Structure formats: structure tokens, C-alpha cells
Design an enzyme around this catalytic site. Structure first.
Site, short mmCIF file in Angstrom:
data_model
loop_
_atom_site.label_atom_id
_atom_site.label_comp_id
_atom_site.label_asym_id
_atom_site.label_seq_id
_atom_site.Cartn_x
_atom_site.Cartn_y
_atom_site.Cartn_z
N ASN A 50 -3.65 -15.09 16.48
CA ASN A 50 -2.68 -16.28 15.93
C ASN A 50 -3.52 -16.75 14.63
O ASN A 50 -4.56 -17.32 14.66
CB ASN A 50 -2.65 -17.36 16.75
CG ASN A 50 -1.72 -18.76 16.30
OD1 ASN A 50 -2.18 -18.78 15.10
ND2 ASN A 50 -0.94 -19.27 17.08
N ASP A 105 -2.57 -18.80 12.12
CA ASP A 105 -2.23 -20.20 11.80
C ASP A 105 -2.09 -20.18 10.03
O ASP A 105 -2.75 -20.87 9.48
CB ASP A 105 -3.46 -21.22 12.05
CG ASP A 105 -3.27 -22.60 11.69
OD1 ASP A 105 -1.92 -22.96 11.95
OD2 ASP A 105 -3.92 -23.07 11.14
N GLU A 107 2.20 -16.84 14.27
CA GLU A 107 2.14 -18.04 13.53
C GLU A 107 1.81 -17.48 11.99
O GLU A 107 1.02 -18.15 11.28
CB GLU A 107 1.07 -18.95 13.87
CG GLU A 107 1.73 -20.24 14.37
CD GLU A 107 0.76 -21.39 14.50
OE1 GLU A 107 0.03 -21.51 15.65
OE2 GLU A 107 0.76 -22.45 13.75
N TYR A 128 4.72 -15.27 20.44
CA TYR A 128 4.15 -16.61 20.10
C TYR A 128 5.09 -17.42 20.61
O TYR A 128 6.27 -17.70 20.47
CB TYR A 128 4.44 -16.51 18.59
CG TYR A 128 3.84 -18.32 18.00
CD1 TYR A 128 2.74 -18.78 18.59
CD2 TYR A 128 4.76 -18.95 17.09
CE1 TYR A 128 2.38 -19.96 18.29
CE2 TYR A 128 4.13 -20.13 16.98
CZ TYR A 128 3.12 -20.80 17.50
OH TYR A 128 2.68 -22.00 17.06
N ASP A 170 -0.24 -15.10 21.81
CA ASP A 170 -0.55 -16.56 22.04
C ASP A 170 0.43 -17.18 23.01
O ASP A 170 1.53 -17.56 22.61
CB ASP A 170 -0.39 -17.29 20.63
CG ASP A 170 -0.70 -18.72 21.07
OD1 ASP A 170 -1.01 -19.38 21.79
OD2 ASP A 170 -0.59 -19.83 19.94
N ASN A 230 0.24 -19.67 24.94
CA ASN A 230 0.26 -21.10 24.79
C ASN A 230 0.16 -21.88 26.04
O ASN A 230 1.02 -22.71 26.11
CB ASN A 230 1.54 -21.55 23.85
CG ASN A 230 1.35 -23.03 23.25
OD1 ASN A 230 1.96 -23.83 23.64
ND2 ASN A 230 0.36 -23.00 22.46
N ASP A 263 -4.91 -16.98 24.57
CA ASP A 263 -4.36 -15.68 23.72
C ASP A 263 -4.87 -14.69 24.80
O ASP A 263 -5.85 -14.82 25.25
CB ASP A 263 -4.98 -15.64 22.56
CG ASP A 263 -4.63 -16.60 21.51
OD1 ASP A 263 -3.75 -16.60 20.96
OD2 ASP A 263 -5.35 -17.64 21.48
N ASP A 323 -7.43 -21.65 13.70
CA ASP A 323 -7.79 -22.14 15.03
C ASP A 323 -7.93 -21.45 15.96
O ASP A 323 -8.42 -22.16 17.15
CB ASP A 323 -7.30 -23.63 15.08
CG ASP A 323 -5.78 -23.62 15.04
OD1 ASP A 323 -5.08 -22.45 14.77
OD2 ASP A 323 -4.90 -24.65 15.17
N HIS A 324 -7.54 -20.25 16.02
CA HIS A 324 -7.71 -19.34 17.10
C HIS A 324 -8.59 -18.31 16.49
O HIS A 324 -8.46 -17.87 15.49
CB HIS A 324 -6.09 -18.67 17.63
CG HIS A 324 -5.28 -19.62 18.17
ND1 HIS A 324 -4.63 -19.31 19.58
CD2 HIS A 324 -4.53 -20.60 17.60
CE1 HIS A 324 -3.92 -20.47 19.62
NE2 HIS A 324 -3.70 -21.09 18.67
#
Ligand SMILES: [Mg+2]
Length: 276
Positions: free
Chosen positions: A26, A28, A54, A129, A168, A170, A241, A266-267
Site C-alpha cells: 500500500n 499511499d 492506494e 484494497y 491491504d 484493512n 497487509d 504509512d504501510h
DNA sequence: CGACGGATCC
DNA sequence: GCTGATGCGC
DNA sequence: GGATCCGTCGATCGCATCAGC
């Protein structure tokens, strides 16, 4: 407590060498991640297949650098038709897949840009995602309905080949999958509803959590940290993830990695080694 | 979503 | 064309 | 009276749009 991923195990439990390396990340924001040198890290990792979530980037705006990956020349991208700059997934592959599809059934009418399906010679790869439950849980019921549709889509895949699902998802499945489980039981990603949907995904398809299968009692292993409050420097994180595998693939499983040091998002990336 | 303040537990 | 503010989602 | 529980508050980022020039 900080975490250091163990060394790469590149041999199956029966002694077979890994032949397939899959990386999932991911990012971001694809354009921002490239500016933060994410692609330099991918080149050092040298995966056979790279899955991105993402991307936040349409088909005309993808940086040139991306086409120029010669060991990842077969590339498939999807973005939502409505919210450009949101969601978006990608799959990049050394070898050309036999089949690529998008979404979980109605994509041609509902282009959400969250799921890519790629069929290869001996397995099917899904990268995903998964939609967020939202701050204050305002889209949690939508997430539960999506989980159920996704579960049904994965089970009813026509091909009888084993499945690799990555990306991800989530949700932190169990308390060991995040640093602050008790403070987060009513926050997106650790509600009882999302945790139960994850358990039902594993049972319904059925699938195994590759990392937890290998490292069933290892704490502090995370793949996400909120940008805020220096959470990553204190390793206050969540494992969001995953590589989830069909039971038939477990003897082929060499290792499931968390690339804690790779920056740009941020992942952090995760990496799978399979002996196929 | 982690940090923080305030309440409750023995 | 470029900057920075705002809105939104995560 | 330390540990835990629990509800509130403000915190970073990337991208789209918009105002201004
Ligand atoms: Mg995110």
C-alpha cells in the site's frame, strides 16, 4: 517494543527452493511514493510480481519510471471512475498472466478500483484494497456487506487452481496484530465486525494467513503506522497487509516477510516466497 | 488512532 | 503555471 | 494507589479543487 523481521527463508519445509517472489505494498499515493524513492526499494527487492494498493492515480498520470521496469513489464492498473485520487490498485508482473480481471463481479458497471485478479499457470493471484470502515465507523455496515460479497466472490472462482490473496485487507485479525488492541476495539480496522469478517474469509474460502502460519506467536509485527505522533518510530502499529493462501499451497510456502525498514508510505511492503 | 484525562478496581 | 488554503478520506 | 478501562480530542499525510496572481 521494536521488531526485526527474521532472515528470509528461501527454502520450503521439504527443502525445495523458492521460485516465485511476490511483493505487496500500500503505497499511499503512487506519485508521492515514487518521489520518496519507493521504486528504488522495489528494484532492490526484485520481485517477480508486485501488487500496489492506494495508487490514487489515473491511467494518464502514472509516472514514466513505472513503464521502465523491465523485469515487471506486464502491468495492470485500475482506478475508480468516480473518486479519482482515491483507492486504485495495480499489479506488475515479470511473466504475462493468462487472464486479468477487475472488481468482484460488477466492475464494468461499478468501477471501484479495489481488486485485480490475475491467473497464472499454477495459481490465481488476487490483490485487494479493502474499503475502510471510516472514522467513527460511519461506513462499517458497508464494509461488512463488502466483506460478504468479497468472500462469496473468492469462494466461487471458476478456476480450480489454488489462490493467493494479498494486499491491504484493512483489519488486524487478532489482538497480537496491533500494538493497542484494547484502545482500538471500536476503531476502524479492529471492530469485532471486521475481525469476524476476516475469520469468516479464512473459513469460507478457505485460506490460511501465511505470516501467522509461520510465526503464530510473534508479537509487534506490523505493516502500518499512522503518520501522526511518530507512531512508526515507536512501532505502534497494526498488521493490515497479508498474504492469504489456499491450504494446498502451504507446502510450497517458504516465507512471509514484513519489510519494516522500507519507507515511502504509512504501510511497509510485505513479501512472499513460494516454491512452485 | 495515539495521547491524555478522569473514573473504577481491589 | 505555481503556490498555498481548504475539504475529504483514511 | 498502581493498573486498567473508557470516552474525548487533535494529530499527518496525499490528492482534488479553488482563489489569487
Ligand atoms: Mg491508507
Amino acid at each position: 517494543a521494536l521488531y526485526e523481521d527474521p532472515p528470509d527463508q528461501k527454502t520450503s519445509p521439504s527443502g525445495k527452493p523458492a521460485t516465485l517472489k511476490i511483493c505487496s505494498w500500500n503505497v499511499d499515493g503512487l506519485r508521492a511514493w515514487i518521489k520518496k524513492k519507493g521504486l528504488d526499494w522495489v528494484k532492490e527487492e526484485a520481485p517477480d510480481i508486485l501488487c500496489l494498493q492506494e495508487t490514487k492515480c489515473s491511467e494518464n498520470k502514472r509516472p514514466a519510471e513505472l513503464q521502465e521496469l523491465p523485469g515487471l513489464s506486464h502491468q495492470y492498473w485500475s482506478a475508480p471512475s468516480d473518486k479519482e485520487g482515491y483507492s486504485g490498485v495495480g499489479l506488475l508482473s515479470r511473466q504475462c498472466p493468462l487472464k486479468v480481471s477487475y472488481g468482484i463481479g460488477d466492475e464494468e458497471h461499478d468501477q471501484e478500483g479495489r481488486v485485480i485478479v490475475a491467473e497464472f499457470d499454477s495459481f490465481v493471484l488476487v490483490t485487494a484494497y479493502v474499503p475502510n470502515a471510516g472514522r467513527g465507523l460511519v461506513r462499517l455496515e458497508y464494509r461488512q456487506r463488502w466483506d460478504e460479497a468479497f468472500r462469496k466472490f473468492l469462494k466461487g472462482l471458476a478456476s480450480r487452481k489454488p489462490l493467493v490473496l494479498c494486499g491491504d485487507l484493512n483489519v488486524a485479525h487478532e489482538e497480537i496484530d496491533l500494538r493497542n488492541p484494547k484502545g482500538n476495539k471500536k476503531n476502524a480496522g479492529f471492530t469485532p465486525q471486521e475481525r469476524q469478517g476476516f475469520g469468516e474469509l479464512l473459513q469460507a474460502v478457505p485460506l490460511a494467513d501465511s505470516f501467522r502460519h509461520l510465526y503464530p506467536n510473534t508479537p509487534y509485527a506490523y505493516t502500518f503506522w499512522t503518520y501522526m505522533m511518530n507512531a512508526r518510530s515507536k512501532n505502534v502499529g497494526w498488521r493490515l497487509d497479508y498474504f492469504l493462501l489456499s491450504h494446498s499451497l502451504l507446502p510450497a510456502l517458504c516465507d512471509s516477510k514484513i519489510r519494516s525498514k522500507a519507507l515511502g508510505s504509512d504501510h511497509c511492503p510485505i513479501t512472499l516466497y513460494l516454491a512452485l
